[PDB]
């Protein structure tokens, strides 16, 4: 109770240090545009849902836009890999927003089979395909590359970071769609796995006037 009160500032901090982190130049991309989406679907569901807990209206528009966005990226990232050119989906910056805007109203005009099954039924295989065919390539690479030099193993971990964010939101909201507090848990898990996995580490940890390893 009064002890878990520290779990709200977590859904009002880690999701803001992220929104601001995105809103730096280099951190602006389609991937970190949808991951920055799950920030408003964690902050709003923490400064508007967690406090008072219309209150059950934004409770659905929030969790029905998540596993929906999770369905988005799984496909976007795919279209990026299955793509004949460089790694970075074709979803333009504006059409990413135009596509992002339509993820909310349809999340508002909205069921466990419509807003949960459907979005997770394919999301787990559109990604499965990816995490898999991302392996054949991973080393269809020239062995010599990296040991004699004179998609790579890096972008192979960026799908590790996005591979657990989609792999944690499943073990957190499945026992519920099959415990309502466990679902709230994935509110301080994303800006937590983004530290020891993706670039975010420095992006936001040093934004607070150089955290610690700032050549301390």
């Amino acid at each position: 109770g009064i002890v878990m009160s520290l779990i709200v500032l977590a859904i009002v901090f880690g999701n803001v240090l992220v929104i601001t982190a995105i809103a730096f130049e280099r951190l602006q991309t389609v991937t970190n545009y949808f991951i920055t989406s799950l920030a408003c679907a964690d902050l709003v569901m923490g400064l508007a849902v967690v406090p008072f807990g219309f209150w059950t209206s934004i409770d659905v528009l929030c969790v029905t836009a998540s596993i929906e966005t999770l369905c988005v990226i799984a496909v976007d990232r795919y279209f990026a890999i299955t793509s004949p050119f460089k790694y970075q989906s074709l979803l333009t910056k504006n059409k990413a927003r135009v596509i992002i805007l339509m993820v909310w109203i349809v999340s508002g005009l909205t069921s466990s089979i419509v807003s949960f099954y459907v979005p997770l039924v394919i999301m787990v295989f559109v990604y499965s395909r990816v995490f898999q065919e991302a392996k054949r390539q991973l080393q269809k690479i020239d062995k010599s590359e990296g040991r004699f030099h004179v998609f790579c193993l890096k972008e192979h971990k960026a799908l590790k970071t996005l591979g657990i964010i989609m792999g944690t939101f499943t073990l957190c909201w499945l026992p519920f769609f099959i415990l309502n507090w466990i679902g709230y848990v994935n509110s301080g898990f994303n800006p937590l796995i983004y530290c020891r996995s993706p670039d975010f580490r420095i992006a936001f940890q040093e934004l607070l006037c150089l955290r610690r390893s700032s050549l301390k």
Epitope: K143, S144, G146, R147, F148, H149, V150, L153, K154, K157
Partner: antibody, heavy 113, light 108 residues
Framework: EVQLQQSGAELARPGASVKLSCKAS????????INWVRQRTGQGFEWIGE????????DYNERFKDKATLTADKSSSTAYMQLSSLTSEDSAVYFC??????WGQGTTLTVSS | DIKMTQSPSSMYASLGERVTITCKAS??????LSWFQQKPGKSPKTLIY???RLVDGVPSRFIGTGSGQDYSLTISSLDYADMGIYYC?????????FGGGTKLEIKR
Amino acid sequence: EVQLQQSGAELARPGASVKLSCKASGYIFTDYYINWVRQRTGQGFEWIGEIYPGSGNIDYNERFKDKATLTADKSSSTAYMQLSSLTSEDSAVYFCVRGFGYWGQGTTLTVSS
Amino acid sequence: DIKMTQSPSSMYASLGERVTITCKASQDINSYLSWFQQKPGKSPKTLIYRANRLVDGVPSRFIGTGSGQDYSLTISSLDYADMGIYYCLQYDEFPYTFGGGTKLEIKR
């Protein structure tokens, strides 16, 4: 001016544990994995494993699977190798290569009472 | 894991002649083989990788050429400074396995 610095001499009591280092300085650390090959006295080479500083992937050779544990330091631009429960037969020269291109200096580790 | 024999072992060539060692692995490394030299009291200096792609700096008299399951390091016009023990390494798959090295001496 390319080089992976190494201790050259390391004494350790049987059962203990040394932690060899290798300060590479002459290229971009994270652009090459660096393996750690062991070459006992007399002759012969036995790869202990390879770690990719950039990522984190550390593919150990079965044999040293639980024996050694590689690790890299992006900042210091030096990498390490944790050798636990050292035994008389763990004594040899431990090399730190840049993926078999440029080898290190070498560390004459020796486990002895 | 993946045995890689390496004939010869011992070998005495005189100055000027073209000496040669031949390496043959168990599997089929896709030209993912390398040749280096160990000189007493020094760390190994690599000469060739990708079965034939000379390293930068290695003298132009070294030649690696094999394919699929058998290769061979070779030098035409053996130079005095060319005394030591060359070994072939395969990095096609884990665990990287070394040859056993053939050692070459010069008849004086």
